[PDB]
């Protein structure tokens, strides 16, 4: 089909000897891609599973570690507090949730299947619906700083696409306003 095509949703540049933590919301970042924001133009409800995949670019002269974790529906309540915990303690909780481990020396990543968990029945996508944003979030933070053997920058890229799609209730309402990913 057309919605089963991988789409870049985030790209990060990693410096040397830094402890950092970034976060995004993949469900609406993917749904606002202009290539996608037109194939869901005339529906009202959506139901599918995201499938993330991480690609690492780092040579054998680097050694470092990163962690990419995913928090399911309901994180908005306990979010203003979770941004106050230091990174090292955040990794303690983040390593129990479904996650992927990024190793720079071996240049390895993985794939991650996100399930559809929601208290309602469908997800609403029409011009102001905040439901896609408040559905699940991705957090990427350093486990160990990045170093190299000298005798300066590594990149992380995430490609997302959803399968098992069901679109219902055709209507005459504009979908969520399309946004070009910041990357």
């Amino acid at each position: 089909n057309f919605l089963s095509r991988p789409v870049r949703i985030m790209r990060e540049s990693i410096s040397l000897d830094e402890r950092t933590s970034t976060t995004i919301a993949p469900w609406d970042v993917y749904l606002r891609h202009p290539m996608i924001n037109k194939k869901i133009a005339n529906y009202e409800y959506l139901r599918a599973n995201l499938v993330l995949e991480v690609v690492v670019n780092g040579g054998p002269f680097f050694y470092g570690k990163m962690l990419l974790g995913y928090t399911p529906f309901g994180y908005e309540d306990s979010l203003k507090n979770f941004n106050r915990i230091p990174i090292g303690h955040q990794n303690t909780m983040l390593s129990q949730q479904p996650h992927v481990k990024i190793d720079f020396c071996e240049s390895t990543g993985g794939v991650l299947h996100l399930p559809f968990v929601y208290n309602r029945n469908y997800m609403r996508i029409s011009e102001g619906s905040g439901e896609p944003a408040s559905m699940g979030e991705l957090r990427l933070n350093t486990l160990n700083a990045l170093k190299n053997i000298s005798f300066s920058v590594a990149t992380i890229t995430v490609f997302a696409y959803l399968d098992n799609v069901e679109l219902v209730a055709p209507s005459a309402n504009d979908p969520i306003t399309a946004q070009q990913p910041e990357l």
Partner: protein, 257 residues
């Protein structure tokens, strides 16, 4: 890599150990959570700051959510809600310790209320009547959380006009009893929601308090400037209680009120 080294020792436990040291086995949380623990005590001391509270043969009503809330200075604490830092004066039970680790919650809750209270000054009065009733959802006119004191007497005596406006239709369900011959109420509260589950990691009082229930007490010879009446709350888990997805163990701390 991931090399598995040689274990330090071996496990050779006897197949009969549950009948040598303890009595039974403790490995299922569903069974454990079915015992009873002591929650807070449901008083009414917020209303006595009013200058016109009724005195003598009144109705004491308290509306509370049907799930225990974490103790401390939670956002909408009931205990002292007219000062900048309201608070919850409960104890951490087993329900409000294993719950925040999960994603989904659904099911009914069992409560037990035990009545006590003296009358400072005067001799005493017979214990009145006690009611526990559900408060269902309505788009307009729902009963707010908190305590209230309703009068039901007139210049002559009992008046049905103000007696009928203290008790609602009582259609959702109720348990009524006389506290002189049976001073305890054991009730079960089902889920009854239009959406599949709620978020166990909630900490605001009102967010939990969308599923309410009310405890009513009819008392004689009371005082409008002091509260001498209480209930003793014991909370367990119903038969259909369910927690579905274990995410991660949250942080905690030691808090003294």
């Amino acid at each position: 890599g991931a090399i598995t080294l040689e274990p330090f020792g071996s496990d050779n436990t006897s197949p009969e150990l549950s009948k040598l040291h303890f009595g039974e086995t403790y490995d299922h949380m569903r069974v454990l959570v079915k015992g009873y623990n002591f929650y807070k005590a449901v008083l009414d001391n917020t209303t006595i700051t009013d200058p016109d509270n009724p005195s003598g043969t009144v109705v004491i009503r308290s509306t509370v959510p049907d799930f225990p809330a974490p103790r401390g200075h939670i956002p909408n604490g009931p205990d002292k809600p007219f000062l900048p830092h309201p608070e919850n004066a409960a104890l951490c039970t087993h329900l409000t310790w294993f719950s925040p680790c999960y994603v989904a919650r659904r099911g009914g809750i069992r409560w037990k209320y035990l009545h006590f209270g003296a009358r400072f000054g005067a001799t005493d009065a017979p214990k009145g009547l006690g009611f526990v009733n559900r408060v269902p959802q309505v788009p307009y006119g729902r009963r707010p959380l908190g305590n209230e004191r309703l009068p039901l007497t007139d210049v002559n005596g009992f008046n049905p006009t103000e007696l009928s406006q203290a008790f609602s239709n009582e259609n959702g369900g109720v348990y009524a009893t006389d506290l002189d011959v049976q001073p305890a109420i054991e009730v079960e509260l089902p889920f009854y929601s239009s959406l599949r589950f709620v978020n166990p990691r909630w900490d605001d009082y009102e967010k939990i308090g969308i599923h309410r229930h009310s405890i009513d007490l009819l008392s004689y010879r009371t005082n409008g400037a002091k509260c001498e009446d209480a209930w003793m709350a014991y909370v367990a888990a119903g038969d259909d209680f369910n927690l579905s997805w274990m995410l991660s163990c949250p942080p905690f701390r030691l808090v003294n009120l």
